[PDB]
Amino acid sequence: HMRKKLKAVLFDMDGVLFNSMPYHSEAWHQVMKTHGLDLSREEAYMHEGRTGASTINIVFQRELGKEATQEEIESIYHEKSILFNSYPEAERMPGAWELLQKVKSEGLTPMVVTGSGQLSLLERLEHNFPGMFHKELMVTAFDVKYGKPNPEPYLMALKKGGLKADEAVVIENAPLGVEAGHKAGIFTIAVNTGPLDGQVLLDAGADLLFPSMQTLCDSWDTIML
Ligand SMILES: [Cl-]
Numbered sequence: 001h002m003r004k005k006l007k008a009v010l011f012d013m014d015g016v017l018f019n020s021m022p023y024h025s026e027a028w029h030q031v032m033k034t035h036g037l038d039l040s041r042e043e044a045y046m047h048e049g050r051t052g053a054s055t056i057n058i059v060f061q062r063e064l065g066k067e068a069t070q071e072e073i074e075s076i077y078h079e080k081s082i083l084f085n086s087y088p089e090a091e092r093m094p095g096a097w098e099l100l101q102k103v104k105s106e107g108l109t110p111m112v113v114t115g116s117g118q119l120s121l122l123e124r125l126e127h128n129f130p131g132m133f134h135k136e137l138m139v140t141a142f143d144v145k146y147g148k149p150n151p152e153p154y155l156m157a158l159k160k161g162g163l164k165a166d167e168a169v170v171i172e173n174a175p176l177g178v179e180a181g182h183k184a185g186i187f188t189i190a191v192n193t194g195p196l197d198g199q200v201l202l203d204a205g206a207d208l209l210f211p212s213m214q215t216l217c218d219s220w221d222t223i224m225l
Pocket residue numbers: 029039040041042
């Protein structure tokens with residue numbers, strides 16, 4: 001009984017609302033390559049959701065056999081941010097406006113759930129999707145102690161929305177994000193908007209898997225039945 005119970009649609013930001021992940025992946029890949037370290041474009045997608053500190057540390061441990069210092073982390077994250085900002089501004093993901101408009105027309109409330117503290121993108125949510133979201137019904141890095149894959153961001157969204165888990169659905173693109181939605185006990189739809197094998201998203205706990213936001217939008221009515 002999904003139509004009867006659903007009140008809210010909890011959208012992830014990077015790779016769901018904004019097509020930002022090719023740029024995050026490229027910046028991570030390239031910053032590491034300039035330092036002689038191997039972080040593939042695909043692997044950068046696997047780590048989507050982790051702090052910059054954790055990603056850097058995973059690479060340092062695997063390739064250099066030690067942890068990074070705080071000054072190594074701060075420098076590399078700064079350089080990553082420089083590269084990302086040098087690329088074009090991330091456009092809306094195709095299909096994201098259409099699905100937002102559709103769920104809104106069905107009387108559902110869109111929410112954003114992200115572990116991001118990236119103000120350049122956070123501020124653009126209002127600019128790029130006017131009337132879709134409300135800051136009281138958003139979860140960002142500023143709201144949470146632990147990000148994805150911990151369920152905290154999604155449980156916080158349920159709390160901010162005054163919702164029970166069965167009154168929400170999560171839309172996620174990343175395996176750590178899917179894990180967070182699933183561990184929050186919420187029906188989680190994976191949208192495989194990157195280069196990863198869809199099996200990684202199923203293994204993370206996805207209830208349904210679609211290859212793109214537009215394909216999800218096209219199939220939304222048949223989910224609701
Ligand atoms: Cl690569």
